[PDB]
Amino acid sequence: GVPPTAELIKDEAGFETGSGEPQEDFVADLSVDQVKQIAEQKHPDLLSYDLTNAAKEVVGTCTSLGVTIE
Amino acid sequence: IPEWKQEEVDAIVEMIESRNTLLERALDD
RNA sequence: UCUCGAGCCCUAGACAGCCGGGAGGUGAGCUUAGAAGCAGCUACCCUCUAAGAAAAGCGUAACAGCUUACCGGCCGAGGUU
């Protein structure tokens, strides 16, 4: 249902494409709160019970693109 | 005497408290 | 084919076989009109869980599909190097 992650990130990230090399090339950042919202948009698309876990899933595609956190 | 089989039983006995052989094992305890 | 020795695994069920499961984020990002395990480059992270790769081998125009890993069951005594 709800759109995919890769995109929901490129929105609040303020950028379009990732980096040739993830974690090696930080394309953007994301406050913890920002991830607390995304995790809410995909409540159905994820198996997790608590919002805590839902994040780990989302927060897993970021550092793997150059999307640091603060 | 694998350690994981030992840790498993403890984890099972922990749930009961609150593989078939491992379940029977935990139950037996 | 016979004999001797060493290491490791095994009734907390080994080795093989057969049956069942092999799941979500997500068709990873990049590249590209497109590439979704599997053209190439890079990364290769976490949920549910008894398991289940950012996928080992086929397969596809690309999907699909078929299996490996991995887990569970049946079986029951040696097995493997």
Curated annotation (Swiss-Prot), chain B:
Signal peptide: none annotated. Has been called L10e and L10E in this organism; in this case 'e/E' is for E.coli-like, not eukaryotic-type protein. Forms part of the ribosomal stalk, playing a central role in the interaction of the ribosome with GTP-bound translation factors. Part of the 50S ribosomal subunit. Forms part of the ribosomal stalk which helps the ribosome interact with GTP-bound translation factors. Forms a heptameric L10(L12)2(L12)2(L12)2 complex, where L10 forms an elongated spine to which the L12 dimers bind in a sequential fashion. Belongs to the universal ribosomal protein uL10 family. This is Large ribosomal subunit protein uL10. It comes from Haloarcula marismortui (strain ATCC 43049 / DSM 3752 / JCM 8966 / VKM B-1809).
